Structure formats: C-alpha cells, structure tokens
UniProtKB/Swiss-Prot annotation, chains A, B:
EC nos: 2.1.1.215
Record annotation: effect of changing residue 170 to A: Decreased tRNA guanine-dimethyltransferase activity
Protein name, entry field: tRNA (guanine(26)-N(2)/guanine(27)-N(2))-dimethyltransferase
Record has RNA-binding as a keyword: yes
One Gene Ontology biological process: tRNA N2-guanine methylation
Result of changing residue 179 to A: Strongly decreased tRNA guanine-dimethyltransferase activity
Effect caused by changing residue 36 to A: Strongly reduced tRNA guanine-dimethyltransferase activity
Gene that encodes it: trm1
Biological source species: Aquifex aeolicus (strain VF5)
Length: 387, 387
C-alpha cells in the first residue's frame, strides 16, 4: 500500500494513520525507529565482540524490517531467521526481502507461533534475538532464553508500560508479581520490575539473563540482555532483587533488600512509606556496551539524529547510576523555589547527572535529606542575592 | 521385558531393580501406585461433576499406564491423548494400549516434546491433564494451564522435594523464587512453595489455577488444581501468598502477609526468627474434592489399600487446616515429657488432628504459646499422677 525507507532498508507496508502513538498497533510503526536503530547497534556490538558470522532471530517480524536492517546494516549476519504467525505478514515480509535484494541463503521465513519457532530443533543457538511484541514480552521470555546461545544478546521491547508504571497495579501484580509505584520515576520502577521478571523466568532453567541496557520512551521500554550460564551467575542476579520504599508526601525513597528492614512511616515527614517491588535494584547500563552504542551510532548516517542525542544522554546518565531519580519541578513545587535553573545547570548543585527518563530529572549520590538541604541552600542564596 | 498389573491395567515394562526409591527414574515405577490411584480418582470426580465425555492428556506418558488406567477405570473418557518424546517409550506405549484391548478411536499417541504436544492447535481444551515429570514440573506448567479447559483439573507430581524442602536452598530460590525452611514441617513448606509457583506462572496469562488437594510422600509431592478464568479469581489467589516465620530453637512459627510485619527475633526465646516464602498460605485441600476421593476410593477393589488409608487420614486432616504443624517427638524432646502418648491420643490434648506429613505430627488452632502450655500441663499431671 505504501513504500517507506528506514536506514538502508526499503519496505512495503500498509498505509498508517496521519498520527500514531509510540506503541501504535499497526503493521509498521515509524515511531519505533529509535528502537530499531538501537537493535541494529546492539547487533553490530556483537559482531565486533564475536568477530565471526552470527545467526539472528526475529520471532515477531511483521514487515521483516528488523531482520532486513540486521542483514543490510551490520557486518556479521550469516543468516537471519524471521517469523510471524500472520499469513499476510508473511506475504509482505517475502516481498520486502526481495525488494532489498537480499540473497535467499541469507534468510529463512517462517509462519509459526513464536514459541514454537524459537524452540524448533535448529541444531544451533541464536546469537542475537530481537523480541518486539505488542504489549508484554512475558509469554516469549523462556523460549527466547532457551533458544539463545551462551553469550548471545537479546534485544527486547515491552509496550505494556501502563501496568508496569503503576496505572494498573493489580494487572501489574498478576503479570509481574510486583507492586509498582506511580511516582515521578515510575517508568524506572516499571523497567526494574520488567527486568526482575525476565531474570526469574530464565533463572528457572539456570540461565542468567544479565541486563546491560535500558531505555524508556513514552509508551515503550527497550532492554538489552546477555545470556550466560552457571548457577552462581544466576545467584548473583537474584541477590540484586529488592524493593523501593517511597513516600508520596515528600518524595523520600529508600532501597530495601532485607525483609526485616521495612518501615511503615516515612522517616522524613512521617507519612505512609509505600513499598515497590520486588524488582531489579542493580545497574541499568553496562558501561562498555552503552559507550559502544553511542560511538558506533555516531559513525552511521542512517541512524536517526534522535537516537544519537538519546544515546549521548544515556552515556552521561550511565556514569552515575542510582535506584530512582529526582524531578526538579516537583522538588521546586515542594519548597517553592524562586526560579528553576535549566536542568543542565541544576544537576550541578546536586553533584548529579541528567536522566533520559524525564526532561528535568536528575540522579545523584546525595541522600534524600542532603538533596532537600541543597534545595534549601539554593532558594536561600537565590533570595539573599536577589538584593 | 516384564509384565505387570496395576489396577485393571496390564503393561509391558523393562525389568526394574530389586528395590527402588519412591522417585526412582525408571520407565515404570510401581511405588508410584498411590500417585496413579489418586489421579484415577481425581478423573472420576470430574466424570461425575461434568456428567459428559471428557478429553484427557498424558503429556509425559512413558509406559502409557496413566492414560490406560484413565480409559479402563473411569466412566467418561471420550479420548485420551498420550505423549512421550522417547521413541522406545512410544513403541512400548503402543503395545500397551493394544495389550489392554483399547479401541483405536479412544486414544492418540504422539512423540513430541511435551510443551509442543500440549500447545498443538487441538481445537479443544483438555478437561484433565496428568503431569508426571522426573523432578520439577515448572517447565510444563504454562503449557498445561493454557492447554486446559476452563473447569478442568490438573493432576500434578513433583519429585524435586529436596530443594523445595530446604536441603538445597539456593537451588530452590533459582527455580521457585522462594526461601524454604528445613524444619519439622519442611515438606509442607515445600508444597506451599510449589503451589505458589504454579499459581504465579498461570497468573501471567490471567489463568487461575486453584489448588484443591495436596499429598506428600517420601520423595514426591502430589497436587491437584482446577483451572478457572477471570482476573478477580487470579487476584484472590495472589492475595493468599505469604510468608512463614519460624524459629529453629523453640519451633515457634507465624504467618506474615504484611511486609511491614517481619520480626528479627523470635518472640518466645529471642533466637533468630527465620523467614520462609513467599508461598501459598491458603487451604491445601478442597473439602468436597477430598471427601469424594476417599468415598470413591472405598468402592474400588483395584485401588491400593494404602491409598485408602492415606485418604482417610487426609480427610481427617482437611477438617483442621493450618499453616505448618507440630511434631510430638520434637516438642517432647524440648520439654522432656515422661512418656509420649500415641499420636492418636496426643492430638486430643491439643484439640488437633493427625497429619499425613509425619507419623507423630499434628495440626491445631492453638497458638504456639498455648501448645507449649499444654506440653507443660501434660508432663505436670503425668508427674503428679505418677504417684
Ligand atoms: N504468538 C505469535 N507468534 C508469532 N507472531 C506473533 C504472535 N503474536 C503476534 N505475532 C506477530 O507479532 C508481530 C508483532 C509486531 N509488533 C512486530 C513488529 C516488528 N518487529 C517491527 O519492528 O516492525 C505482529 O506482526 C503479529 O503478527
Ligand atoms: N520434554 C519432554 N517431552 C516429552 N516427554 C518427556 C520430556 N521429558 C521427559 N519426557 C518423558 O517423560 C517421561 C516421564 C515419566 N516420569 C513418566 C511416568 C509415567 N507418567 C508413569 O506414571 O509411569 C519419560 O518417559 C520421558 O521419556
Ligand atoms: Zn515523606
Ligand atoms: Zn524461638
């Protein structure tokens, strides 16, 4: 119905509405461009790390765009295995591979349910898997983990951000077995819950799925994991499950890994100290992986400018990783600050860094009390020097 | 190699060792007789409840004994679907169906991996599934839940009792995401952990798998679940997840569902108050289902006498359901009781009932302090009337 270009790929896709959401359930959504850019960069990383030809899986392929961009824009793909349960998805996919002049022996197209596709007796494990569902990836996690080769990377998307972010808490509990927190850093809480779920499902088979990258945008989450083996590595991951206590009155927060250590009342203002989790309380970014993504992205003209800006922000963010973050406007509303300095400047007063999660958000190693003290010191010297 | 009879069935099986464990990994284990008796009784229950022909699944069939006994010893099986990934398992299974003169249109034999077998596009859901693995059932739970019809019953076995019972705690955590308790009621803790795992895996798909029967013997667990639909029912199940605090010094125990409520020290003796769970803190037995099993068992000559005795004990036990139980010998060792009355008599002093879990174990609604008080009152009137 319509021809579009993304990166080096050209594809035929049904016409899409004048405007779409980031998680729009259409055959091809151009707003997922950043997502696919990241997936391509993540694969190139593996190309450079393994230094050999890899086999990649695209179990939920639709137009075939991801598999195609993998083949066209990375150096090491021996063969791409694309799949979709939808028959017309398949037809379109076929024509799209041909449209990009991709040799037949470079790919396989299948029309199976994704779990069956992944669990086929291939005789080999996948080095790279991109799992890109509408909604939750939960139903496919185990099959992906089992199908992947040791040291392989998973490119993952989830669009069920509403439950994970606290809009629908009972729904979140049913699917992820965790209590969410609908606060100023709700998207981070959501991502950490998702990570926990991925890890525990793989852990059932003594597979260690280590998170190495996180990205939140509007109504989707983007994660990367690397698969490893050994019960000790699984154990290490599990040890980094925990909870976040958070106060809606004053925004105080605290990480708890010791079940004996929960506090009913917020030590700051005495309001109810809510509990979020259990969830991943470890790092959201592997420094080296993240740095590579950024550097490699900059060498590619076919990578969106936005992806490059986001990666630069995430690089900065990855150097001061914390559980949760602060939002300047909300702190300001709390202490009535005369004027809010631009976030780039604001973070400096807190020895912090910007976060991609929210425009005026920031991470810091300072304690909550210290942060509030800084909010008072500022405002105090703002008012004093105001004459 | 050898012909054996179990119930009404006659089967050919490889010769087995002079002696075997309850969980012996052989083609056919006669020590699982009680397990299979229960499975047959559970199916007849469904026969009487639905009053129509049912389709049953035996995804891990081996000799075919369960499917065969279902067909021969119950009234309502329209068709049995048996499966095993092992080729010689298949050969044997075929001959066994013929040996029992079962009409061809009454069964189907498949040689697939059990998850693929279960997830086949059958065009119908299974009314009854018997899942009988060596070790953990975890890898098959989701496929079973999805394949089952609403209102269908699951007959489940697990033989990985060592991790669940606290012998291997890190292994338990990896597979079940729970801390076990290697105490006097360790097998109950293990079962409640297993139940929790089953529920949460089904919950991922908004399926409510309600436990209705539990049985622990030596090195295996036997559970029954019924499948239901509706997020509210799933919610109800999740609400019955919780923890058990237990003291190894004095055997004090307490159920905690409120994360804020954990105590570091045992309120009785001040020793460390350990935490087990999260796990199922609800009922282990549906009264009606359990009663039926017992009554129906008594009408069947081909049902083991042992199964009948066990069911009678469980019937008694199901009328006073508690989280955890006490073991007389261990309490006695604690307070040095002159003589331990037979458990049948002992339970009366505690307003309790016997438990099938352990010979001299008992359940009671009395608090720990009350139990200990009874241990002191007894011993006191034992010594006073000793002259
Ligand atoms: N269970 C399933 N098995 C296989 N394919 C599925 C299944 N469920 C959904 N799909 C396909 O899943 C695809 C999901 C899409 N979000 C894929 C998007 C694609 N990766 C892109 O970047 O454009 C749809 O094309 C569905 O047809
Ligand atoms: N993944 C699998 N898919 C299908 N069959 C399997 C799988 N793993 C193990 N099996 C078969 O699982 C069976 C497990 C047995 N414990 C079955 C016992 C049988 N239910 C009985 O009562 O005698 C073995 O016969 C294996 O061949
Ligand atoms: Zn507060
Ligand atoms: Zn104690």
């Amino acid at each position: 119905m319509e021809i579009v270009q993304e990166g080096i790929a050209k594809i035929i896709v049904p016409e899409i509405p004048k405007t779409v959401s980031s998680d729009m359930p259409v055959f091809y959504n151009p707003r997922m461009r950043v997502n696919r850019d990241l997936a391509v960069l993540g694969l190139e990383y593996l190309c450079k790390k393994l230094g050999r030809p890899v086999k990649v899986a695209d179990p939920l392929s639709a137009s075939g765009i991801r598999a195609i961009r993998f083949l066209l824009e990375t150096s090491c793909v021996e063969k791409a295995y694309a799949n979709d349960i939808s028959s017309k998805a398949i037809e379109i996919m076929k024509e799209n591979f041909k449209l990009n002049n991709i040799p037949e022996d470079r790919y396989e197209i299948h029309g199976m349910e994704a779990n069956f596709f992944l669990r086929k007796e291939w005789g080999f494990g996948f080095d790279y898997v991109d799992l890109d569902p509408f909604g939750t990836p939960v139903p496919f996690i185990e099959s992906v983990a089992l199908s992947m080769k040791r040291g392989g990377i998973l490119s993952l998307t989830a669009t069920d951000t509403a439950p994970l972010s606290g809009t629908y808490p009972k729904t979140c509990m049913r699917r992820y077995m965790a209590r969410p927190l609908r606060n100023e850093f709700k998207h981070e809480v959501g991502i950490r819950i998702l990570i926990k779920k991925v890890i525990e499902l793989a852990a059932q088979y003594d597979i260690a799925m280590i998170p190495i990258f996180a990205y939140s945008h509007l109504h989707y989450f983007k994660l990367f994991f690397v698969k490893e083996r050994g019960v000790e590595k699984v154990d290490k991951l599990i040890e980094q499950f925990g909870y976040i206590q958070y106060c809606f009155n004053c925004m105080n927060r605290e990480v708890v890994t010791d079940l004996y250590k929960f506090k009913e009342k917020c030590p700051h203002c005495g309001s109810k100290f809510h509990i979020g989790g259990p969830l991943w309380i470890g790092k959201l970014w592997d420094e080296e992986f993240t740095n590579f993504l950024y550097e490699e992205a900059q060498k590619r003209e076919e990578i969106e400018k936005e992806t490059k800006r986001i990666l630069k922000l995430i690089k900065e963010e990855s150097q001061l990783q914390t559980v949760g973050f602060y939002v300047l406007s909300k702190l300001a509303e709390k202490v009535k600050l005369p004027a809010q300095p631009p976030i780039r400047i604001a973070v400096k007063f807190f020895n912090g860094v910007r976060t991609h999660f929210v425009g005026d958000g920031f991470r810091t190693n300072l304690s909550f009390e210290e942060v509030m003290k800084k909010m008072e010191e500022l405002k105090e010297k703002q008012k004093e020097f105001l004459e």
